[PDB]
Design an enzyme around this catalytic site. Structure first.
Site, mmCIF file in Angstrom:
data_model
loop_
_atom_site.group_PDB
_atom_site.id
_atom_site.type_symbol
_atom_site.label_atom_id
_atom_site.label_comp_id
_atom_site.label_asym_id
_atom_site.label_seq_id
_atom_site.Cartn_x
_atom_site.Cartn_y
_atom_site.Cartn_z
ATOM 1 N N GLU A 1 48.766 38.403 46.008
ATOM 2 C CA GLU A 1 48.905 39.570 45.146
ATOM 3 C C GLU A 1 49.788 40.656 45.743
ATOM 4 O O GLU A 1 50.576 41.296 45.028
ATOM 5 C CB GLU A 1 47.526 40.131 44.796
ATOM 6 N N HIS B 1 47.509 25.695 27.162
ATOM 7 C CA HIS B 1 48.857 26.222 26.988
ATOM 8 C C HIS B 1 49.453 25.813 25.649
ATOM 9 O O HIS B 1 50.183 26.592 25.025
ATOM 10 C CB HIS B 1 49.741 25.756 28.138
HETATM 11 ZN ZN LIG Z 1 50.661 35.235 40.898
#
Ligand SMILES: [Zn+2]
Lengths: 596, 195
Positions: A357, A487
């Site tokens: 992150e 998806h």
């Molecule tokens: Zn990521």
């Protein structure tokens, strides 16, 4: 009064209004996610509607300016970005019709139900328990009933909707000068430039084909090894030559093979490296985790992180009545505000996720200087690849020894390296054939080469020929298996994963070359090397201003994707698998079927 | 018995926009600039031209002060011989300016939850301003050849726009307060030197 002056002025007005709109929308969404209530979701809806209306009005306004006469690269880039005009071309009634298709598909996926045949009372939804059954269980019939029931309950409902969905999407694609929807999706990597850096929409297919042809042998050998190992647990069902059955691959769709580790450990006696207990020993806390990650990032050469990050970001799961979604994420609100939200516990996984992150946040901070319309990555894959490099570099034993988690006297043994390589391979190498096959099927369906009558015949033939997986129960034309994936129902592309997995190892190879590392690639560590940080920053600063081919050229020295570094990464595994598969068979034959 | 209104300006609840900057003239009072100088509470005080050392006795005819507020990234834009939106169209300094400029952060007073939209500045203009000139005009800017006829529309833009300050913004977008002290350099008796 040339059109340049005219476009430049329009652009300036847009830039100063859109900044203020986007900040308001992002702030509303953040407080919704941090603090859940009815007022919060109402505020999100209001802000989002306002932002969408402004963007649509501005885009319709600027369809007016001729584009050819612009002779500056950056301004041309911005004008092209603002002039997408995707779905407004369709008429109002058809737009409503398509919107109701999308909503119905998402709702049906979210609220699906499947029930046991023996006990009708027990009915489970996918997320709470079907995944638990598929990840944990080791019974043939238990897995088979779940695999069959999910498809039988979902695909039959989904398929008629998907028919109208593909028809209407093809119509809209044709309305805006594209041959098919597949061309629309492929145009993301399309870019026009001057000197040797251009890229054509059709070249992507050839590049993917060429990469797959080289990657095939490693997949063949890993497939053989997994077959031999799985022969023990399921004696009768698995055949020595045939393809592996679909429902034993470790997950619902076979996308990942990470859950098959316990059955396929090469050396069960020696354990994998985990430093959770050492972390609890030294009384660490979440801020300790993030401070160590920041220390690594300043060691490589990138800046420190802003004070607002420490002041405003949520770094732990909060107590009280407040309810918070637990999915990790990184946010770039705009106008100089960067925050990270994740519930941090004391584990190795939290350590690695924090590194990933912060990496995204570093990318976001770097390209902040460029104009608003260009504030994004070079393409889809770059953003994830940049994050992956840092985690791969952080996981090495040498870094763990340096920071202080592992005892100095500890030294590495070849068995542990082989185990680590196999675990990484099961996740990285296995996913490529699945994504490639799914993308090819979708492209062929969109173009019209595959007639409507033989969709499933083609799907399972492609699976058998490419991936090496055979269906347990024969399936008629009523079913719609591909719609089971998340998806496909929610309209996202899938080639981004293939692209990212290719670029990641190229970046790592280049940086390790710069940093003067000797030995196998999998032991590389980029800590305490300023040159690598500066080289990465040079690419990060560019953003979307210049072609992504130029961005790759800056760092690696080549203009196109190359798969050789990926093979170099797993060379010892290749030798060991070659040694181990001496007597076993390599390859699969298509005739054999479980139902016979 | 009159004293310089140094504190009166500082405790103001509101400061005017850059385009409508306020000029206050200093007269018939003496203010100690040393205490302000020695405090160094300000991070940004970098000024050149006049040496702080043993240049305090040379007298000045009069002292002028101008106050306006802008974003942090534009604090460098207030310097002689520089180019950008604020400098060219809002506030211009002569090349041979002699004096110093003082800026300090003002996050806490100005920022408000939900945004502060009162503050204003100008985007577009026909020509660059020459030193020490102020414009209040709110006439519509015309870019195309077509007459605007007094209504906003295609190729017609309003001249002024709003700042939008919020407390959670980054360092660059935070409000900074800038006050300049201009000393006139002329061969004049310069009676009140104001050391
Ligand atoms: Zn990521």
């Amino acid at each position: 009064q040339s059109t340049e002056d005219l476009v430049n002025t329009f652009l300036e007005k847009f830039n100063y209004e859109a900044e203020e709109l986007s900040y308001q929308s992002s702030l509303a969404s953040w407080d919704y996610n941090t603090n859940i209530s009815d007022e919060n979701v109402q505020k999100m809806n209001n802000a989002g509607a306002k932002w969408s209306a402004f963007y649509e009005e501005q885009s319709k306004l600027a369809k007016t300016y001729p584009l050819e006469e612009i002779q500056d690269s950056t301004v041309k880039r911005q004008l092209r970005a603002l002039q997408h005009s995707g779905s407004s071309v369709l008429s109002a009634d058809k737009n409503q019709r398509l919107n109701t298709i999308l909503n119905s598909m998402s709702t049906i996926y979210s609220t699906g139900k499947a029930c046991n045949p023996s006990n009708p009372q027990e009915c489970l939804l996918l997320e709470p328990g079907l995944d638990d059954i598929m990840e944990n269980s080791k019974d043939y019939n238990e897995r088979l009933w779940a695999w069959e029931g999910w498809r039988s309950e979902v695909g039959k409902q989904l398929r008629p909707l998907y028919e109208e969905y593909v028809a209407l999407k093809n119509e809209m694609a044709r309305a805006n000068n594209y041959e098919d929807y597949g061309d629309y999706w492929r145009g993301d990597y399309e870019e026009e430039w001057e000197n040797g850096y251009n890229y054509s929409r059709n070249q992507l297919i050839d590049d993917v084909e060429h990469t797959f042809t080289q990657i095939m042998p490693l997949y063949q050998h890993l497939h053989a090894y997994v077959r031999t190992k799985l022969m023990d647990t399921y004696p009768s069902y698995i055949s020595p030559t045939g393809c592996l059955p679909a429902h034993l691959l470790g997950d619902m769709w076979g996308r990942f093979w990470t859950n098959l580790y316990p059955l396929t450990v090469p050396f069960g006696q020696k354990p994998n490296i985990d430093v959770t207990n050492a972390m609890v020993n030294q009384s660490w806390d979440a801020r300790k985790i993030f401070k160590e990650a920041e220390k690594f990032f300043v060691s490589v050469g990138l800046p420190n992180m802003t004070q607002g990050f420490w002041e405003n970001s949520m770094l732990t799961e909060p107590s009280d009545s407040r309810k918070v979604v637990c999915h990790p994420t990184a946010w770039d609100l705009g106008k100089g505000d960067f925050r990270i939200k994740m519930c941090t516990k004391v584990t190795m996984d939290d350590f690695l996720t924090a590194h990933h992150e912060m990496g995204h946040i570093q990318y976001d901070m770097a390209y902040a200087a460029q104009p608003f319309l260009l504030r994004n990555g070079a393409n889809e894959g770059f953003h994830e690849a940049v994050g992956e490099i840092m985690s791969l570099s952080a996981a090495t034993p040498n870094h763990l020894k340096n920071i202080g988690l592992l005892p100095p006297s500890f030294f590495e043994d070849s068995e542990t390296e082989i185990n680590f390589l196999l675990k990484q391979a099961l996740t990285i190498v296995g996913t490529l054939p699945f994504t490639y096959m799914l993308e090819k099927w979708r492209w062929m369906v969109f173009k019209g080469e595959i007639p409507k009558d033989q969709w499933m015949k083609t799907w399972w033939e492609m699976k058998r020929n490419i991936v090496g997986v055979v269906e347990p129960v024969p399936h008629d034309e009523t079913y719609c298996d591909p719609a089971s994936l998340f998806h496909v129902a929610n309209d996202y592309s899938f080639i981004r994963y293939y692209t990212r997995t290719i670029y990641q190892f190229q970046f790592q190879e280049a940086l390790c070359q710069i940093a003067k590392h000797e030995g196998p690639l999998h032991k590389c560590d980029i800590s305490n090397s300023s040159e690598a940080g500066q080289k990465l920053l040079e690419m990060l600063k560019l953003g979307k201003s210049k072609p992504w081919t130029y961005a790759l050229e800056i760092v690696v020295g080549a203009k196109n994707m190359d798969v050789r570094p990926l093979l170099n990464y797993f060379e010892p595994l290749f030798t060991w698998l070659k040694e181990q598969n001496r007597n076993s068979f390599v390859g699969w034959n298509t005739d054999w079927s479980p139902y016979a | 018995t009159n004293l310089c209104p140094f504190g009166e300006v500082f405790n103001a609840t509101r400061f005017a926009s850059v385009y409508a900057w306020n000029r206050k003239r200093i007269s018939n009072c003496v203010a100690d600039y040393s205490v302000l100088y020695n405090s160094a509470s300000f991070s940004t005080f970098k000024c050149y031209g006049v040496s702080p050392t043993k240049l305090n006795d040379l007298c000045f005819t009069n002292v002028y002060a101008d106050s306006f507020v802008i974003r942090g990234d534009e604090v460098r834009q207030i310097a002689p011989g520089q180019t950008g939106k604020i400098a060219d169209y809002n506030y211009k300094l002569p090349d041979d300016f002699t004096g110093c400029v003082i800026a300090w952060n003002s996050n806490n007073l100005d920022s408000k939850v939900g945004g502060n939209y009162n503050y204003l500045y100008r985007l577009f203009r026909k020509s660059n301003l020459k030193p020490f000139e102020r414009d209040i005009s709110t006439e519509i800017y015309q870019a195309g050849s077509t007459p605007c006829n007094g209504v906003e529309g295609f190729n017609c833009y309003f001249p002024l726009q709003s700042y939008g300050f919020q407390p959670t913004n980054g360092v660059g977008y935070q409000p900074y307060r800038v006050v300049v002290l201009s000393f006139e350099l002329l061969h004049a008796p310069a009676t009140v030197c104001g050391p």
